[PDB]
Write a protein that binds this ligand. Structure first.
Ligand SMILES: CC(=O)N[C@@H]1[C@@H](O[C@@H]2OC(C(=O)O)=C[C@H](O)[C@H]2O)[C@@H](OS(=O)(=O)O)[C@@H](CO)O[C@H]1O
Ligand SMILES: CC(=O)N[C@@H]1[C@@H](O[C@@H]2OC(C(=O)O)=C[C@H](O)[C@H]2O)[C@@H](OS(=O)(=O)O)[C@@H](CO)O[C@H]1O
Ligand SMILES: CC(=O)N[C@@H]1[C@@H](O[C@@H]2OC(C(=O)O)=C[C@H](O)[C@H]2O)[C@@H](OS(=O)(=O)O)[C@@H](CO)O[C@H]1O
Ligand SMILES: [Mg+2]
Length: 966
C-alpha cells in the first residue's frame, strides 16, 4: 500500500493492497469508541499479519484511502478486455455471527454519516469478498472513506481482516455466494435422477465399492496433465515447505492457496515490487492438489506402517488447510472459473483417501466443497442428456472427476441413484448423434470437437471414455451396449486413419504434431475387456498391435491367445471430415477435401498460420511409423506444397490466414469427399471453389480433382483449373519430403539422383520414385518440376523462420492459362523395375486406366489394373457409359463387374446438415443400363434399364450386388 489513491493514473492497473507487511501499517485506519484494531500473527493471507478487529454491535472502523474509481469503459481500455474496478478483502471468523457486516463508501465519513454492500457473517474459516465498485453497490469521484460497520442486532464480536484490495478485474468473475450477492451467479448443481431407482442391496453396494477400487487401481498402477511424484522424500519436502500448523481453537496457519485464475484479481504484472514479493509466497492450488494426490497414491502403496501413517496425516492436514482457506460450500472465493485445472487431482485423491476422510469426519465437508465448485460444470454434472452432453473435453478432463464426486456422496441410496443416473448419462452421451457440429461421436466413426472431426481432441476422449466403460463393467452400473458399440466404431476408425499418427490432413491446428494412437493404446484393452462377451477379439488384436505386444503375450492379458492385428487393408470413407483412407501393405494414404460442413483448416492466433491448403484434395502417403522419419519435417516445409493438393504458390505473408485470430474456412458447396466399394476401392471428389470476397483468397481459383484408389495404386486426375492470373503460380504437388542420410535417393526414369541442389523438368511418360518408395508416373502434364533444394519456411505457431533440405515434385499449370488439367498415377510399392513395367503398360495404348469423362459435370476413371470404375458426379447428369446412365444428385458412384455380378456403390459426401441442424438422409436415384436383379439399396427394372434408390446418411456409402436378367 502506497500514499497514492486507488486507481492512480501513474498506473491505473497497479493494485493498492493493505497486507500490513509495511512500516506504520494502521496509518490509513481510524476506529470509533466501540472498536479496537491490532495486528495478529495468528493467521494471515498476505504477509505474516492480519487485522484483528474487536467490536461492540453496530460500531465501525474506517480506511482513509482516496479512490479515483474508473468507469468499466476506462478500466477495460486500460487492460484490453471487459473490466471493472473491484474492492476485495479476506475475513476470518473463529465463530459464526447471526447478522451482516456493512461496507460503506463515501467522502469524509465518520461513524454517523452514498453507496455500499452487505457481507453475511454466519460462517467460520477464511472467506473472500469481491464486488464491482461500478455494478455491485446499492460512486462520485470524491470517495476517500471505506467504513466497516459491525452488525447492529448482535451485542459484541470479533473478525480478522487481511488483504483489503483495490484492483481492476475481469468483469465476468465476481460471483455471488452465501456471504455476498453480486450481479453474477453460477447456480448450484441440481442432479437429474433416472427411474426406476436401484435399491440399496449388498450386491449394489458391493458394485459401488468395486468401482471405487477399480478407480484407485488405475491411479496407483500414466496420466497426461498429472505431474506424478513417487519419491516420498520429495513429497515430504514439498509438504513441509507449505509451513502448515494447526491452531489451538481451530483452523490452520500456512501459505495462502490461490488458483491460476484467481491471481488475475491482483493484476500481478502491475503489482508494486513490495506486493509482488508477498504475492510470490502464495501456493498455486493445482500444485497443492497434485501434491495431495501424490501423497494419497504413496499412502495406498506404502508397506511401512510408520511412513503410511505420516502420509495419511500429511493428506488430512493438507485437507484441513484447504477447507480453512475457504474452499468450502457456499464460498465463491470471488471466482473459481476453470476449476478443473486447479482441482482435477483433488477429486481423484478423495477416492484413495475415502476411509481416511470418513474416520476423520471430513467426508461431508469435502463432498459439499467439491459439489459446490463443480457447479461451473452444471451442464454435464446435472446428468440430464442434451445435445451438448457428448463434449469430448468432458470425456478427457472431467468424466472420472464427476464419477469420483458421486462416489463421495455420504448417503448409500443417494450414491446409488447418482451412479445409476451417471451410467444412463454416459450411455446417452456415447450413443446419441448430436445435431449439426456439436461435439461427439458420429455414425461413420468420426468424432467431433470445434464443429468437426478432430483426432487431437477425440483421442484423449477415447482413452478416458473406454476407461469409464471398463470401470463400470459387469455391474448394475455398466454402460449400455449402444454406447460400447458406438465407441468401438470410433476407435476401430482411428486405428484405420492413423499409422500410428493421424496424417497431416487430420492434424487440426497442430501440423507436424499429430496425435498418435500410441497415446490411446490402453483404451483398446479397456474397451476389449468391457465387451458384453469379453474380450472383443478385434479391439484386443488392435491393443496388441499398437502396444507392440506378441501373440505369446496375449493369453496373460486377455485370457486367450489373440494374434496382434495386421495393418488394415482397403479403402474406408470418412465424410465426417471429407476424407478417406486407402491402405495397402504398411502404407496409408489420407485423401482429404472440405465443403460447407467440413472446415478446411483450424487456424488460431498462434496455430496453423499457413494451413490454408491442409484439405486442398491432399493425398498424404504415410508408411507405418514416425512421419518425421519419413521426411514430414516442419523446418523448411513449403506450406504451398501439401502432397496431392492443387494450390496457388504464395509468399508466406499472403498464405497466412487473413484473420489475426481464428479462421475455420468452410467450403462453398455441400459436395466434396470420398466413397468406397467392397471395402477395397475408393474415390475422392474435390470441387475446389474459393469465397467470392475473402482477403488473400483468389475468388476465381478453381479445380475439379478426383482420385481412384485400388490395391497398390492411385489414379489422380484434375480438370477445369483456373485462377485470376492465367494459372500463374498454380501447381499440383506430387510429393514433398525432407532429405536425410536415410531419405537421400530419388529415381527419375531409371536414374538415381542424390545431388543437392538438383532441378529438372519432366512430362508425359516420365516417372520418379521418392525416398519413401512411392512411384509417380506422369500420364498427362506438359510440365513437372523436380527439385532437391534448400527451403526457407516459417513455423506454424509464431511464424519464426525455419530452413531444411527437401525433395519435391509439382505440376506447373501456368502452361495452360485456362482450364488446366493433369493426370498421374502413384504406385505404393514402386521399384525402378516395376516403374519400367508400368511406363511400358502406359505406352501400350494406356493399359493402366482410361478417363471416360473429365469435365465440370463428371469425372469417370476406369482402372484397368483393378477393373473398377469411379464416377464423380460434381453435378447431376445423364452420361454415356456401359453401366451408369444417370444420377439425379451430386454423388460418387463406383462399379465392379466380376464374373456374374455387377457391384454398384453410391453416396453423397454431402452430410446434408448445417452447424445447427441434424444430418438427414439424401435419396439418390442411379439409373444403370440394362436389366438387373440382386443391402438396403432398392432396385426396380424400368424398361431396358434399372433404377437403384440409394439412401446416403452422413456420407456413408451403400452398395448392392446385382446379377443380369435375361
Ligand atoms: C477461444 C478459441 O479460440 N476457441 C474456443 C475453444 O477454445 C480452444 O479450445 C479449447 C478446448 O478445450 O476445446 C481450450 C482453449 O480455450 C482453446 O484452445 C473452445 O472454447 S472452450 O473450450 O475453451 O470454452 C470451444 C468450445 O467449444 O470454442 C472455441 O471457440
Ligand atoms: C487439439 C488439441 O490441442 N488437443 C489438446 C492436446 O494438445 C495436443 O496434445 C498435446 C499434448 O502433448 O498434450 C500438445 C499439443 O498442444 C497438441 O498436440 C493437449 O493440450 S495441451 O495440454 O498439450 O495444451 C490436451 C491437454 O488436456 O488437450 C488436448 O486435447
Ligand atoms: C465477425 C465474425 O463473425 N467472424 C467470424 C469468427 O467469429 C469471431 O472471431 C472469434 C475468433 O476467435 O477469432 C470469435 C468470435 O466468435 C467472433 O469475434 C469465427 O466464427 S466462429 O468460429 O467464432 O463461429 C470464424 C470461423 O471461421 O468466422 C469468422 O470470420
Ligand atoms: Mg497480511
Amino acid at each position: 500500500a502506497t500514499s497514492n489513491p486507488a486507481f492512480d493514473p501513474k498506473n491505473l492497473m497497479q493494485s493498492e493492497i493493505y497486507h500490513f507487511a509495511q512500516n506504520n501499517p494502521l496509518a490509513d485506519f481510524s476506529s470509533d469508541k466501540n472498536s479496537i484494531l491490532t495486528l495478529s500473527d495468528k493467521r494471515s493471507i498476505m504477509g505474516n499479519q492480519s487485522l484483528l478487529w474487536k467490536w461492540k454491535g453496530g460500531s465501525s472502523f474506517t480506511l482513509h484511502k482516496k479512490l479515483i474509481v474508473p468507469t468499466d469503459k476506462e478500466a477495460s481500455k486500460a487492460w484490453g478486455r471487459s473490466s471493472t474496478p473491484v474492492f476485495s478483502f479476506w475475513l476470518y471468523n473463529e465463530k459464526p455471527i447471526d447478522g451482516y457486516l456493512t461496507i460503506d463508501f463515501g467522502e469524509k465519513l465518520i461513524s454517523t454519516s452514498q453507496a455500499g454492500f452487505k457481507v453475511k457473517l454466519d460462517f467460520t474459516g477464511w472467506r473472500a469478498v469481491g464486488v464491482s465498485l461500478n455494478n455491485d453497490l446499492e460512486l462520485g469521484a470524491k470517495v476517500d472513506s471505506i467504513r466497516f460497520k459491525a452488525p447492529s442486532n448482535v451485542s459484541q464480536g470479533e473478525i480478522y481482516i487481511d488483504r483489503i484490495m483495490f484492483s481492476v478485474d475481469d468483469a465476468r468473475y465476481q460471483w455471488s455466494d452465501y456471504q455476498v450477492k453480486t450481479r453474477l451467479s453460477e447456480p448450484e448443481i441440481q442432479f437429474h435422477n433416472v427411474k426406476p431407482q436401484l435399491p440399496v442391496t449388498p450386491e449394489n453396494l458391493a458394485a459401488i465399492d468395486l468401482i471405487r477400487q477399480r478407480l484407485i487401481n488405475e491411479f496407483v498402477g500414466k496420466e497426461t496433465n498429472l505431474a506424478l511424484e513417487e519419491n516420498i522424500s520429495k513429497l515430504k519436502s514439498d509438504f513441509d515447505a507449505l509451513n502448515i500448523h494447526t491452531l489451538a481453537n481451530g483452523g490452520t496457519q500456512g501459505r495462502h492457496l490461490i488458483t491460476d485464475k484467481q491471481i488475475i484479481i491482483y493484476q500481478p504484472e502491475n503489482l508494486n515490487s513490495q506486493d509482488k514479493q508477498l504475492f510470490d509466497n502464495y501456493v498455486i492450488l493445482g500444485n497443492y492438489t497434485t501434491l495431495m494426490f501424490n501423497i494419497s497414491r504413496a499412502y495406498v502403496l506404502e508397506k511401512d506402517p510408520t511412513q503410511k501413517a505420516q502420509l495419511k496425516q500429511m493428506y488430512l492436514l493438507m485437507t484441513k488447510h484447504l477447507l480453512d482457506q475457504g474452499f468450502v460450500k457456499g464460498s465463491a472465493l470471488v471466482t473459481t472459473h476453470h476449476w478443473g485445472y486447479s482441482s482435477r487431482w483433488w477429486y481423484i485423491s478423495t477416492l484413495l483417501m475415502s476411509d481416511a476422510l470418513k474416520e476423520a469426519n471430513l467426508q461431508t465437508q469435502v463432498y459439499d466443497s467439491l459439489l459446490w465448485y463443480s457447479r461451473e460444470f452444471k451442464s454435464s454434472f446435472d446428468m440430464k442428456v442434451s445435445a451438448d452432453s457428448s463434449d469430448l473435453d468432458y470425456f478427457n478432463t472431467l468424466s472420472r472427476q464427476h464419477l469420483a464426486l458421486l462416489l463421495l456422496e455420504p448417503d448409500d441410496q443417494k450414491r446409488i441413484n447418482l451412479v445409476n443416473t451417471f451410467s444412463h448419462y454416459i450411455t446417452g452421451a456415447l450413443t446419441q448423434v448430436p445435431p449439426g457440429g456439436k461435439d461427439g461421436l458420429r455414425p461413420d466413426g468420426t468424432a467431433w470437437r470445434h464443429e468437426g472431426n478432430y483426432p487431437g481432441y477425440s483421442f484423449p476422449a477415447f482413452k478416458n471414455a473406454s476407461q469409464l466403460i471398463y470401470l463400470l463393467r459387469d455391474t448394475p452400473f455398466s454402460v449400455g451396449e449402444s454406447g460400447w458399440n458406438n465407441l468401438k466404431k470410433a476407435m476401430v476408425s482411428a486405428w484405420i486413419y492413423s499409422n500410428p499418427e493421424v496424417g497431416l490432413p487430420l492434424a487440426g491446428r497442430h501440423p507436424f504434431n499429430s496425435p498418435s494412437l500410441k497415446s490411446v493404446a490402453q483404451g483398446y484393452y479397456w474397451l476389449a475387456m468391457s465387451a458384453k462377451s469379453s474380450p472383443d477379439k478385434t479391439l484386443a488384436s488392435i491393443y496388441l498391435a499398437i502396444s507392440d505386444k506378441t501373440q505369446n503375450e496375449s493369453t496373460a492379458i486377455f485370457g486367450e491367445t489373440i494374434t496382434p492385428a495386421s495393418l488394415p487393408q482397403g479403402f474406408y470413407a470418412f465424410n465426417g471430415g471429407a476424407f478417406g483412407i486407402h491402405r495397402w501393405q504398411d502404407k496409408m494414404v489420407t485423401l482429404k477435401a472440405y465443403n460447407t460442413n467440413v472446415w478446411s483448416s483450424e487456424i488460431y492466433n498462434k496455430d496453423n498460420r499457413y494451413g490454408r491448403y491442409q484439405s486442398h484434395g491432399v493425398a498424404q502417403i504415410v508408411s507405418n511409423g514416425s512421419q518425421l522419419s519419413q521426411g514430414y519435417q516442419q523446418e523448411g516445409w513449403d506450406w504451398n506444397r501439401m502432397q496431392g493438393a492443387t494450390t496457388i504458390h504464395l509468399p508466406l505473408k499472403d498464405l497466412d490466414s487473413p484473420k489475426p485470430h481464428t479462421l475455420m474456412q468452410r467450403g462453398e458447396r455441400g459436395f466434396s469427399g470420398t466413397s468406397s466399394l467392397e471395402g477395397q476401392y475408393g474415390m475422392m471428389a474435390f470441387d475446389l471453389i474459393y469465397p467470392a470476397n475473402l482477403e488473400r483468397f483468389d475468388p476465381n481459383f478453381t479445380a475439379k480433382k478426383s482420385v481412384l484408389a485400388a490395391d497398390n495404386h492411385l489414379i489422380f486426375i484434375g480438370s477445369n483449373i483456373n485462377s485470376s492470373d492465367k494459372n500463374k503460380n498454380v501447381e499440383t504437388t506430387l510429393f514433398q519430403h525432407a532429405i536425410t542420410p536415410t531419405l537421400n535417393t530419388l529415381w527419375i526414369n531409371g536414374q538415381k539422383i542424390e545431388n543437392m541442389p538438383y532441378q529438372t523438368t519432366l512430362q508425359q511418360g516420365d516417372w520418379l520414385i521418392d525416398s519413401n518408395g512411392n512411384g509417380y508416373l506422369i500420364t498427362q502434364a506438359e510440365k513437372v518440376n523436380v527439385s532437391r533444394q534448400h527451403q526457407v519456411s516459417a513455423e506454424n505457431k509464431n511464424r519464426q523462420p525455419t530452413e531444411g533440405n527437401f525433395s519435391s515434385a509439382w505440376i506447373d499449370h501456368s502452361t495452360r492459362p485456362k482450364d488446366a488439367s493433369y493426370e498421374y498415377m502413384v504406385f505404393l510399392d514402386a521399384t525402378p523395375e516395376k516403374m519400367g513395367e508400368m511406363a511400358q503398360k502406359f505406352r501400350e495404348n494406356n493399359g493402366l486406366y482410361q478417363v471416360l469423362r473429365k469435365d465440370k459435370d463428371v469425372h469417370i476413371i476406369l482402372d484397368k489394373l483393378s477393373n473398377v470404375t469411379g464416377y464423380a458426379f460434381y453435378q447431376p447428369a445423364s452420361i454415356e457409359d456401359k453401366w451408369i446412365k444417370k444420377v439425379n444428385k451430386p454423388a460418387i458412384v463406383m462399379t465392379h463387374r466380376q464374373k456374374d455380378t455387377l457391384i454398384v456403390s453410391a453416396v453423397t459426401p454431402d452430410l446434408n446438415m448445417t452447424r445447427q441442424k441434424a444430418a438427414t438422409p439424401v435419396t439418390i436415384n442411379v439409373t444403370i443400363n440394362g436389366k438387373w436383379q440382386s443391402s438396403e439399396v432398392k432396385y426396380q427394372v424400368s424398361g431396358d434399364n434399372t433404377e437403384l434408390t440409394f439412401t446416403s446418411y452422413f456420407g456413408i456409402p451403400q452398395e448392392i450386388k446385382l446379377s443380369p436378367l435375361p
